[PDB]
Amino acid sequence: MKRTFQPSVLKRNRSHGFRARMATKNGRQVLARRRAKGRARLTVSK
Amino acid sequence: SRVCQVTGKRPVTGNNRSHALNATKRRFLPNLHSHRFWVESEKRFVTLRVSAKGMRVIDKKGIDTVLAELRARGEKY
Amino acid sequence: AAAAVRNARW
RNA sequence: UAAGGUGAUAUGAACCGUUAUAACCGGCGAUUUCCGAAUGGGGAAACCCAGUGUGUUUCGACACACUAUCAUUAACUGAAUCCAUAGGUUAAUGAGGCGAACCGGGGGAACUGAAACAUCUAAGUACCCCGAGGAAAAGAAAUCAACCGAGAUUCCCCCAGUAGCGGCGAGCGAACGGGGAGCAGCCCAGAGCCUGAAUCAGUGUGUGUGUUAGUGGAAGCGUCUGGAAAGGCGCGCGAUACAGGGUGACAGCCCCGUACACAAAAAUGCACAUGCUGUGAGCUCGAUGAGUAGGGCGGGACACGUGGUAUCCUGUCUGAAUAUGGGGGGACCAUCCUCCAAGGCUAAAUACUCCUGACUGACCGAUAGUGAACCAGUACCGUGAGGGAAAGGCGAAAAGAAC
RNA sequence: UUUUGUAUAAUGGGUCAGCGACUUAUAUUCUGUAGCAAGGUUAACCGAAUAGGGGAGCCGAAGGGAAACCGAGUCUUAACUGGGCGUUAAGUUGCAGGGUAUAGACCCGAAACCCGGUGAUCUAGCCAUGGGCAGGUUGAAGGUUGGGUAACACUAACUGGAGGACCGAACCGACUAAUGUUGAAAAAUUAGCGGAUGACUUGUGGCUGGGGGUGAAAGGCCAAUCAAACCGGGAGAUAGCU
RNA sequence: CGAAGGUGUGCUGUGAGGCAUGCUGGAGGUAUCAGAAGUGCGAAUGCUGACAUAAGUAACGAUAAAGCGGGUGAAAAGCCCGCUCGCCGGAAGACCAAGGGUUCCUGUCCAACGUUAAUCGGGGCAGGGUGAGUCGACCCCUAAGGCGAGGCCGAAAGGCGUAGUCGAUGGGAAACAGGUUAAUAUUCCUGUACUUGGUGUUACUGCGAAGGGGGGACGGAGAAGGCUAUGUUGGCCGGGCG
RNA sequence: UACGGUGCUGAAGCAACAAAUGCCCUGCUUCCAGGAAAAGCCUCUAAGCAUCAGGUAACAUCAAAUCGUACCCCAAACCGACACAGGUGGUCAGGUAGAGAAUACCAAGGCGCUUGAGAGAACUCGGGUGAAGGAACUAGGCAAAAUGGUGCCGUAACUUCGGGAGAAGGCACGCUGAUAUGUAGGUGAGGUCCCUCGCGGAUGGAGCUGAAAUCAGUCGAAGAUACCAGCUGGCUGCAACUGUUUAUUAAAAACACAGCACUGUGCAAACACGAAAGUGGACGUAUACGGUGUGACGCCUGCCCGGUGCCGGAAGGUUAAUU
RNA sequence: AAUUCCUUGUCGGGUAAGUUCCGACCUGCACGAAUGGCGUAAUGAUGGCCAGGCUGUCUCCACCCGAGACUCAGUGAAAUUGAACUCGCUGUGAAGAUGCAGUGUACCCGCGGCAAGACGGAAAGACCCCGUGAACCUUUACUAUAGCUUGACACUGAACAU
RNA sequence: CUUUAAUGUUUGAUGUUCUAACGUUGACCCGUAAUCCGGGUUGCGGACAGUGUCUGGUGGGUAGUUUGACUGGGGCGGUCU
RNA sequence: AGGGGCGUAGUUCAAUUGGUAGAGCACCGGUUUCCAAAACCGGGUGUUGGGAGUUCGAGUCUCUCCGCCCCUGCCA
Ligand SMILES: [Mg+2]
Ligand SMILES: [Mg+2]
Ligand SMILES: [Mg+2]
Ligand SMILES: [Mg+2]
Ligand SMILES: [Mg+2]
Ligand SMILES: [Mg+2]
Ligand SMILES: [Mg+2]
Ligand SMILES: [Mg+2]
Ligand SMILES: [Mg+2]
Ligand SMILES: [Mg+2]
Ligand SMILES: [Mg+2]
Ligand SMILES: [Mg+2]
Ligand SMILES: [Mg+2]
Ligand SMILES: [Mg+2]
Ligand SMILES: [Mg+2]
Ligand SMILES: [Mg+2]
Ligand SMILES: [Mg+2]
Ligand SMILES: [Mg+2]
Ligand SMILES: [Mg+2]
Ligand SMILES: [Mg+2]
Ligand SMILES: [Mg+2]
Ligand SMILES: [Mg+2]
Ligand SMILES: [Mg+2]
Ligand SMILES: [Mg+2]
Ligand SMILES: [Mg+2]
Ligand SMILES: [Mg+2]
Ligand SMILES: [Mg+2]
Ligand SMILES: [Mg+2]
Ligand SMILES: [Mg+2]
Ligand SMILES: [Mg+2]
Ligand SMILES: [Mg+2]
Ligand SMILES: [Mg+2]
Ligand SMILES: [Mg+2]
Ligand SMILES: [Mg+2]
Ligand SMILES: [Mg+2]
Ligand SMILES: [Mg+2]
Ligand SMILES: [Mg+2]
Ligand SMILES: [Mg+2]
Ligand SMILES: [Mg+2]
Ligand SMILES: [Mg+2]
Ligand SMILES: [Mg+2]
Ligand SMILES: [Mg+2]
Ligand SMILES: [Mg+2]
Ligand SMILES: [Mg+2]
Ligand SMILES: [Mg+2]
Ligand SMILES: [Mg+2]
Ligand SMILES: [Mg+2]
Ligand SMILES: [Mg+2]
Ligand SMILES: [Mg+2]
Ligand SMILES: [Mg+2]
Ligand SMILES: [Mg+2]
Ligand SMILES: [Mg+2]
Ligand SMILES: [Mg+2]
Ligand SMILES: [Mg+2]
Ligand SMILES: [Mg+2]
Ligand SMILES: [Mg+2]
Ligand SMILES: [Mg+2]
Ligand SMILES: [Mg+2]
Ligand SMILES: [Mg+2]
Ligand SMILES: [Mg+2]
Ligand SMILES: [Mg+2]
Ligand SMILES: [Mg+2]
Ligand SMILES: [Mg+2]
Ligand SMILES: [Mg+2]
Ligand SMILES: [Mg+2]
Ligand SMILES: [Mg+2]
Ligand SMILES: [Mg+2]
Ligand SMILES: [Mg+2]
Ligand SMILES: [Mg+2]
Ligand SMILES: [Mg+2]
Ligand SMILES: [Mg+2]
Ligand SMILES: [Mg+2]
Ligand SMILES: [Mg+2]
Ligand SMILES: [Mg+2]
Ligand SMILES: [Mg+2]
Ligand SMILES: [Mg+2]
Ligand SMILES: [Mg+2]
Ligand SMILES: [Mg+2]
Ligand SMILES: [Mg+2]
Ligand SMILES: [Mg+2]
Ligand SMILES: [Mg+2]
Ligand SMILES: [Mg+2]
Ligand SMILES: [Mg+2]
Ligand SMILES: [Mg+2]
Ligand SMILES: [Mg+2]
Ligand SMILES: [Mg+2]
Ligand SMILES: [Mg+2]
Ligand SMILES: [Mg+2]
Ligand SMILES: [Mg+2]
Ligand SMILES: [Mg+2]
Ligand SMILES: [Mg+2]
Ligand SMILES: [Mg+2]
Ligand SMILES: [Mg+2]
Ligand SMILES: [Mg+2]
Ligand SMILES: [Mg+2]
Ligand SMILES: [Mg+2]
Ligand SMILES: [Mg+2]
Ligand SMILES: [Mg+2]
Ligand SMILES: [Mg+2]
Ligand SMILES: [Mg+2]
Ligand SMILES: [Mg+2]
Ligand SMILES: [Mg+2]
Ligand SMILES: [Mg+2]
Ligand SMILES: [Mg+2]
Ligand SMILES: [Mg+2]
């Protein structure tokens, strides 16, 4: 039975990619928080 | 935005009161109006977004004097 | 999780 | 600075050095791919696609450089429209973003308390936004006092849980004055007479004192137990060094250090002196911040919730005097004191610690202490924001067990 | 543990080990204790600095009264023989402790409220661009040729191929029953069932964001969560309850 | 010459306890009197770790089905080979996109992983393997939509939007057959083609836009007709005489 | 030769018929709900060149980069915590029977589903058959059983004249031969004429393919023999209907629905989303749009304006800021 | 009657027997005309009722084929659990006893079965109540408020007539 | 003082006509390769409309809350000094 | 059941609500009409459900008791 996750690289990058996150300050605040936290993978982009 | 180009008046916030003194947040905005002022030196009409209080000071101060301050202010009339 | 068995006595 | 050395797991290999071009440490440079403010354009970040110009040639191409936007300034051109103006094209500068807390400003809750709940409280807190600095902000009386006087601002202790505020409930909560920390005053609203005066900012030029590598640094043997002595038992010695650490069990004299005494080619901080570049000191005569103060209306800020409510800020509507004049002295008036708003600048005492160094602890000792003593913001979970672990100890030496 | 009352067939616990709940700051009152004593004591700060300095202040030795005032008295009243409150009686500063107060205030636990973000890769609707629907029936309008009319109308035959038409696979739906219920599967399988050229279905993108969306409307759906999503913050909300 | 710790034993106090010792261990421990507390645990459906219980019970994942001989091996119901049997065959076959990321091929190994064993494996280890002018992507072009110079608006943040610039799921130049590797192939090889640009030569010569026009360029349903893929039969060729 | 393989050689390699959902077809016909864009491409000239440049044509020549390319891809490799009876878009579409991509059996090809071996109890699950009765069961014919195809005959109330209707009900179905040794039909060679001449036209009928019907015979209990494949009728409530809905206990009489009516709305429309700008409404204009209720169609929709709303009136009473 | 309490109203039809169904009656507790009324062909995984066919639905189950269950080998869970040396009866008792009293019975221990009890397991009861709990929703509850609307003033002027 | 007739004044009430604020989601020109915007020209409207402050009305459109206790369970009834 | 309301002329309703009960129709009597009615004139009617209390005095005020109405009898 179809579940909630249907993979799509183009959709995934357009929704949570580095350029999508950094386009707005609110997403840029996510990057600031993840940089402050020390995340190994800042964004979802490969 | 709602900013007077002469006096610099901008929206301010306050409270709606009531007979029960209940306070609700509100905004007070200036009585801004777009007017075409005749500047004699350039023999031209220059349009300014001014408040009603700003209109009174233009007569008192002169059209040229206020614009001189505006150029100092860099408001880009 | 579960769903409260409607074995309910009303 | 050096007789050793090619980072770690992590051996090995191939080598480099040994008295000074091994290595290591520090100063100053060089290089510094791609993404990212990202800035040639685009983009699903680490990719795609150019333009211009210079210079290369093997005539297939190739190598550099430049080309974002905005602000400011200056040129050149350039509409309707005659001048103009808007606009346009160049060229110079500057800004973009990131970062812990502290700071100023623009916005601004609710849970909660009131044993409910509207005013009120929570609270101008949380949070969002803007801006700046090493501090910020504030700041040189239209201030207070009370008929005596004080003399900018900030911070601390009192005053005092006082005076007051308050469904006069919950609760909120000064000031005057005093004791301290630290103190610093100036400029414009204008012209002269003097004159480059003081002072400040740039910079070089030295000195002094730091910072960024370092140098030297005292003094013990014997015996006993024991795998091993730093322990025991003897007898010494140093101490401006008995702070600590390491060494086969507890070391002042084994090692590293420590106390002291020293050190800089180069860069840099700080301070003094000094030289240039600006900067104006002093004197006289003037001038004395107007859509402002004040007022009406609606709010806000003052401990002060409209109350009899001064004072401050103003969204709205009005609107003076102006030194022969105004402001304040908690409604208001008179008298009397005190000050001169509607222009600015200003160090110190104050707040904070992402970061650097040293040191300290009746702080923790692996379920504790940072989530993390371990390749931890990792593994893992979640579309995402985000959440988030477990896991330390062989022995003195791996001698890690040939056969 | 909670109760008038539990062997109770009331709650709790499979066991062990580790961890796990009356603390802290400030102020205030009381007790104890120590010092000084009608006095006691300093705070900030200074300071080679736990000393010393600093008495700014605080408490006490005098109260009565709303207050002005008076004072071992005072208030009340015109006045008290009065009456109320006072007048012989040591306090103060440390330390420890018992209370109280403000803070999370002994610990654990809400459903929620508010703020800022993340989500329409699921699903709902919509937008753009593509795809899919075996086969077999029924035989509308219209058309032609006749018959009929003055002309129509009308009628017959033959052509035609209309439909949110029919039967029925793919596809899509999910009505009944059995199984399954620690599932093969956090909603399915088996045998039947409805739609199946359409208000159909589907692929790939896009858009609408939380008091908001979207909804052929069930309070449905909005990432296994919906009468107000998720994440973080206020936040150790609050919890007269257990 | 054996500290703490642990594990026995003995003694002792009214109790919480204390003392001493045997063994374990192998380096710390600490009198006394004071001082400070993260100062005492059985419970909180407490938290974390470890270990029981049910229990050698349920289950071992579609009732499509296996059997034998041989091989390898320490070991074969499960691997390899062979011969049968059975299952799918609009799929349970073949090729892709999306998505995954080496699972592909070869060698080697059986701890863990595989619901058993395993010599086997999508497990562990080491090598190898993905070859394009024509296939895709990139590129040119635009849809929905996004972003958006200036601009307009808005406390700030920001919102909308013009010129523009992105954005396929659509529109745009061209390759087929054969062969070959353990694993790749319209990519390699063989054979035979084709396309778009650049340069040069020769001849003939109106070129030219961010502009105009044409074209690109488009629905649903239905009806046949002409065909091919493909299948069948015959012929032909080769083999067979059961 | 290493079961692979490697090397060499290598015959025929045709016709007819059938035939797509593929191609012609981006066509044709028809309908109303009236069915992208841009660029490449073709062409036209402006300004700016017209000796040049540039264009056209023919040769020669260069260049075609970069990235992806294994493998899985209805699954043990993706989404489901699993080597999970689930989900996942496109392309390909063999033979016999059949209308068919249903179904049954097979080809190519791929598998036997990663615990087995015994035993043959109760009971449970998935199935088979059943004397006699035939719904007595049970809330209820739940389930099961039964019906089932083609052709033909025949077919009621009622009706909106379309339906109801596959109404019901019944008959014939195999095989062989004959009609007719392989028919009707379809396809169509050779041959023979004609051509301003070709992938031609007209004749011509060989050869293939091939129903359907009738008659005769024959076998069985049974000939639509398996699989496949409607149970039917009568009365009545509700909703007109196809459709939609509580993903995951409710598919309905609920919602929607065409239709009807009321009402708002004159276009800078009302309204809605937005502090605003603006956008939708709509590039529409009352034969339009929004809102509300009702819900095809047929016959119809009566009385009340007191209450509450709404609309109209504006004289008077009352009444804010302001003065 | 999808409405009717009394109620299984009364009568008729259907059945051997019909609280349902169908037809009427009207006494409409408490129908009623676009919150539409009445009819209505067709349609319906629509509700109720009846008939035929049909049958293991049943009288009343029997046998058979498979998959489990059982035995062996291998791998190997789970919910639960204060501790157990865990009998019946009658009585008592936080008032329904394996555990108390009395009395009876019972050698120790598996395996296959059935579920009466262990107030069995699951989940701090959804019903009820309570808290000066929470949330959504309604309205002529209260207080506000967006929006809409009124006027004054400002943006905002001139002239004339009454 | 009343009655007041006229007289200027000061405020308003309408009505009419203007343009010059303001409006234009009318036309035209330019910025400009532009259905935005701005500027220019012109027309129309016009001291209205519209907006600001203040103010009356309306306002489940949207919020924050209240909506008692005793009670042989609660509600209903009754009760509260 | 429980709670509210009601009982007035012959039938339907006013009542005053502490001191003396009306209206409509019906009925009766008299006119009018050939006669009935319609119309006109005139008029008599009541224990105010029953009882027991208040009070100097009750249909009225209080409480039971009959009869008749209207409401409730709800959550598991
Ligand atoms: Mg770039
Ligand atoms: Mg409260
Ligand atoms: Mg600095
Ligand atoms: Mg040294
Ligand atoms: Mg001044
Ligand atoms: Mg003023
Ligand atoms: Mg004020
Ligand atoms: Mg007062
Ligand atoms: Mg007050
Ligand atoms: Mg005041
Ligand atoms: Mg440890
Ligand atoms: Mg910890
Ligand atoms: Mg830890
Ligand atoms: Mg551990
Ligand atoms: Mg007891
Ligand atoms: Mg118990
Ligand atoms: Mg328990
Ligand atoms: Mg004391
Ligand atoms: Mg001291
Ligand atoms: Mg003093
Ligand atoms: Mg006295
Ligand atoms: Mg205390
Ligand atoms: Mg406490
Ligand atoms: Mg249909
Ligand atoms: Mg069908
Ligand atoms: Mg149908
Ligand atoms: Mg959900
Ligand atoms: Mg909410
Ligand atoms: Mg949260
Ligand atoms: Mg808080
Ligand atoms: Mg809490
Ligand atoms: Mg210790
Ligand atoms: Mg011992
Ligand atoms: Mg040791
Ligand atoms: Mg503790
Ligand atoms: Mg367990
Ligand atoms: Mg076993
Ligand atoms: Mg058992
Ligand atoms: Mg068993
Ligand atoms: Mg078993
Ligand atoms: Mg299996
Ligand atoms: Mg074998
Ligand atoms: Mg691997
Ligand atoms: Mg493999
Ligand atoms: Mg093994
Ligand atoms: Mg492998
Ligand atoms: Mg190639
Ligand atoms: Mg390539
Ligand atoms: Mg191609
Ligand atoms: Mg911009
Ligand atoms: Mg935009
Ligand atoms: Mg593009
Ligand atoms: Mg594409
Ligand atoms: Mg392959
Ligand atoms: Mg391949
Ligand atoms: Mg062919
Ligand atoms: Mg057409
Ligand atoms: Mg699978
Ligand atoms: Mg799962
Ligand atoms: Mg998985
Ligand atoms: Mg699918
Ligand atoms: Mg099939
Ligand atoms: Mg088969
Ligand atoms: Mg059996
Ligand atoms: Mg059964
Ligand atoms: Mg059967
Ligand atoms: Mg048989
Ligand atoms: Mg039978
Ligand atoms: Mg029989
Ligand atoms: Mg029966
Ligand atoms: Mg029976
Ligand atoms: Mg049935
Ligand atoms: Mg059957
Ligand atoms: Mg029928
Ligand atoms: Mg009925
Ligand atoms: Mg229906
Ligand atoms: Mg339907
Ligand atoms: Mg459901
Ligand atoms: Mg659905
Ligand atoms: Mg259902
Ligand atoms: Mg309806
Ligand atoms: Mg009326
Ligand atoms: Mg009305
Ligand atoms: Mg009934
Ligand atoms: Mg009867
Ligand atoms: Mg009936
Ligand atoms: Mg009705
Ligand atoms: Mg009506
Ligand atoms: Mg109606
Ligand atoms: Mg029915
Ligand atoms: Mg029957
Ligand atoms: Mg027992
Ligand atoms: Mg008993
Ligand atoms: Mg018993
Ligand atoms: Mg047993
Ligand atoms: Mg049983
Ligand atoms: Mg049982
Ligand atoms: Mg239980
Ligand atoms: Mg409970
Ligand atoms: Mg509950
Ligand atoms: Mg209560
Ligand atoms: Mg409300
Ligand atoms: Mg509240
Ligand atoms: Mg109560
Ligand atoms: Mg209820």
Swiss-Prot record, chain A:
Protein keywords: Ribonucleoprotein, Ribosomal protein
Entry GO MF terms: structural constituent of ribosome
Keyword Ion transport part of the UniProt annotation: no
Pfam families: Ribosomal_L34
Record bears the keyword Ribonucleoprotein: yes
GO biological process terms held by the UniProt record: cytoplasmic translation
Any one GO CC term of the record: cytoplasm
UniProt subunit comment: Part of the 50S ribosomal subunit.
HAMAP family in alphabetical order: Ribosomal_bL34 (MF_00391)
Family note: Belongs to the bacterial ribosomal protein bL34 family.
Protein name: Large ribosomal subunit protein bL34
Curated annotation (Swiss-Prot), chain B:
Pfam families per record: Ribosomal_L28 (PF00830)
Oxidoreductase listed as a keyword: no
Swiss-Prot/TrEMBL keywords: Ribonucleoprotein, Ribosomal protein, RNA-binding, rRNA-binding
Any one Gene Ontology BP term: cytoplasmic translation
SUPFAM superfamilies, per database record: L28p-like
Family: Belongs to the bacterial ribosomal protein bL28 family.
Summary of subunit composition and partner proteins: Part of the 50S ribosomal subunit.
Name of the protein in its database record: Large ribosomal subunit protein bL28
Source species of the chain: Escherichia coli (strain K12)
